[PDB]
Amino acid sequence: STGSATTTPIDSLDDAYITPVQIGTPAQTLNLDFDTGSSDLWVFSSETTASEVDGQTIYTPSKSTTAKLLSGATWSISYGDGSSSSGDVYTDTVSVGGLTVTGQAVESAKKVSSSFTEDSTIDGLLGLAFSTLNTVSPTQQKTFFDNAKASLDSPVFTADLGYHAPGTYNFGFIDTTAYTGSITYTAVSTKQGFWEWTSTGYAVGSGTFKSTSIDGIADTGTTLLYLPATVVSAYWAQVSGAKSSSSVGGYVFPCSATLPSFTFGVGSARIVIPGDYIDFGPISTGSSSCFGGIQSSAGIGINIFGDVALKAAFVVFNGATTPTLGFASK
């Protein structure tokens, strides 16, 4: 089997991408944030505290003839940005782009933190990291990809995120028309539960490539590119007037600037992030200070190849017995 679904930016900045997902019988379609940096499929629901729902579409398990309470199971996650959610668990039929999993754990939110409430466009998350990070207790549940894998034509999914435009998540096949050149594959460590890999270096604009190992995670659920402070300083030094602002929370730059590209290495291959992809717009409405899309990971504990990086590539998440990642230009 295969599946193929369009993913759409939630706003004009590509802050996140939403993908329609069919849950239950009859289908209830929710728009979920596919998140390779995490492993729970959770939804706003008829159980979510009413004051914490503000425009999201909810899953109502009592209206699904295939929903079953997973007795005794609870979940609770805290994300790197400080947001969180928790609740109980149902199993139900879940379909993405024509690919159907029966008995998928659908984690129903009883509580969500304010950032989720305040974003009416995201009805939940669909985790695509390794199932060892799933938070359901006392019995850990599998991700949608883990449940689908054996049925897929090939045990892979691909992320093709658009810049200011829709893109595609495919399951079970590699669309050879969706990228240019070849796909360069690189080793993955699953030791932390993530799609963790080592970039071979970087360049700023037309500058020379610096060969240096940068371990990080491919995380579709993180907006920005978080890299070591040395790398980030080298990038922003090429933008007149750019500076790190403790009060804003990262590097800002004059909105009148033209940003240089940023290149990262994948083995001997190179993925070029155009400068425009690094512009996240005014820090507040009407400001001439703009927020940068490349930020320091120093306070995180891990480097994160988020959407800013991934949207410049066609990315293969290869879930073979020994997982690997592939990157192609597009």
Residues forming the active site = 35, 199
Does 117 bind ligand RAY (CB under 6 A)? Our answer is: no
Does 73 bind ligand RAY (CB under 6 A)? Our answer is: no
- 26 to 65, contacts with ligand RAY by CB under 6 A? 38-39
Alpha carbon separation from 252 to 150, 229, 240, 319 (Å, rounded): 46, 15, 11, 37
Using CB under 6 A, pick the residue from 16, 43, 73, 77 that binds ligand RAY: 77
Does 85 bind ligand RAY (CB under 6 A)? Our answer is: no
Q: Which stretch binds ligand RAY (CB under 6 A): 26-34, 92-100, 129-137, 299-307?
A: 129-137
Q: Closest CB to ligand RAY among 39 and 104?
A: 39
Backbone torsions φ then ψ of 277, nearest 5 degrees = -70, -15
Q: Taking a C-beta distance cutoff of 8 angstroms, is the pair 128, 144 a contact?
A: yes
Q: Closest CB to ligand RAY among 133 and 308?
A: 133
Q: Which stretch binds ligand RAY (CB under 6 A): 72-80, 227-235, 253-261, 319-327?
A: 72-80
Q: Closest CB to ligand RAY among 93 and 147?
A: 147
Buried-state track 11-28, b at ≥16 Cβ within 10 A, e below 16: eeebbbbbbbbbbbeeeb
Q: Closest CB to ligand RAY among 136 and 269?
A: 136
Using CB under 6 A, pick the residue from 85, 117, 135, 199 that binds ligand RAY: 135
Nearest to 305 by CA among 226, 187, 202, 211: 226
Does 129 bind ligand RAY (CB under 6 A)? Our answer is: yes
Q: Closest CB to ligand RAY among 82 and 286?
A: 82
Q: Which stretch binds ligand RAY (CB under 6 A): 75-83, 86-94, 141-149, 302-310?
A: 75-83
Q: Closest CB to ligand RAY among 73 and 204?
A: 73
Which residue's Cβ lies closest to ligand RAY? 133
Q: C-alpha angle with apex 175: 171 to 180, nearest 5 degrees?
A: 135
Identify the DSSP state of 176. T
Identify the DSSP state of 83. -
Nearest to 92 by CA among 122, 62, 116, 112: 62
Q: How far is the C-alpha of 241 from the C-alpha of 254, rounded, in Å?
A: 6
Q: Which ranges of the chain would DSSP assign to H, the alpha helix?
A: 114-117, 144-148, 229-236, 307-310
* Contact characters 227-256, ligand RAY, x per CB under 6 A: ------------------------------
Does 304 bind ligand RAY (CB under 6 A)? Our answer is: no
Q: Taking a C-beta distance cutoff of 8 angstroms, is the pair 330, 311 a contact?
A: no
Q: How far is the C-alpha of 264 from the C-alpha of 259, rounded, in Å?
A: 16
Q: Is the peptide bond between 61 and the residue preceding it cis, with omega within 30 degrees of 0?
A: no
Give me the least distance between CB of 134 and ligand RAY, in Å please: 6
* Residues found near ligand RAY in the complex (CB under 6 A): 38-39, 77-79, 129, 133, 135
